[PDB]
Point group: C3
Chain length 114, copies 3
């Protein structure tokens, strides 16, 4: 799994330990080992949501399985709550795109997971 | 819908009001209310198109529905036109990836749109 | 084809000519003319892989066709090799997402490739 956060919140407001907290929480939520989880945080972005430049985030979660109707609602609760608590972003100004990847379409370590 | 523009144009060449103009134009084009539309502009990028570093842009438009053959041609004319007029990027150095998303795969406000 | 590299390696560690090298290697690997190939390198990113901030990369290769089980392994060897050689990133700290794009969902030059 890989999780990306793009946000207009400034770098200075991203707290220490945030990438590690994301890694641990995603490990718990998805059931996958933390050593496979990649997290990417992109602050200071030029963004608008609903025409407004108040804090917002556009996120993606890519996963080989563990993606689906019920699971995606659980991920959204978990991730919106983390973003609200740590970055002070309102949950109704966050979009998270969920992608269920075929293992043959993820390259790693000079091969793919096929 | 969410629209993202990556470009090597510098931030200073991104005109004031560009994010609002994109929000308005995408609302018109998709028929969705502007309160739903998210826009992300990323300037100053290290990019090449066809092996050259002249202005170029790599964009994505994600939408729940309203994606398809003829619609995508219409969006391309609209968006290439804006990028040409506002950022001085030639339409043959723009790629726009179109993604039709399932409502169950878009999180927002602690749940999904499903 | 479009190829994106996101990495926490610093901007100064990216060799001049890296974009041109990527363009030629991808043209050879996919069999597509280099005029069509777009490359985007994003250094200095706030990233973690497996909970650790050592150099890593998250990449995407989008292509209209030429995506599949065997192809994707040969791509992964080539790209992992090049990132290891040139940016000093260990190949087990790289993810490459492969996307097969329909031509009707790729806009370019005021239209689509359909
Ligand atoms: C993480 C991973 O290894 C898994 O098994 O889910 C991952 C998932 C999806 C993509 O595209 C890259 C890494
Ligand atoms: C915008 C939106 O909510 C709609 O009605 O389509 C949107 C579409 C798709 C994605 O992935 C995020 C936001
Ligand atoms: C490159 C291209 O034009 C091809 O022939 O595949 C390309 C492929 C896919 C996307 O999304 C953008 C550009």
């Amino acid at each position: 799994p890989m999780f990306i956060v793009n946000t207009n919140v400034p770098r200075a407001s991203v707290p220490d330990g945030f990438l590690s907290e994301l890694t641990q929480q995603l490990a718990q939520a998805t059931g996958k080992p933390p050593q496979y989880i990649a997290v990417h945080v992109v602050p200071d972005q030029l963004m608008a949501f609903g025409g407004s430049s108040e804090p917002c985030a556009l996120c993606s979660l890519h996963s080989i399985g563990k993606i689906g109707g019920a699971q995606n609602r659980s991920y959204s609760k978990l991730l919106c709550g983390l973003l609200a608590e740590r970055l002070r972003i309102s949950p109704d100004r966050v979009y998270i795109n969920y992608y269920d990847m075929n293992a043959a379409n993820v390259g790693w370590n000079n091969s793919t997971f096929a």
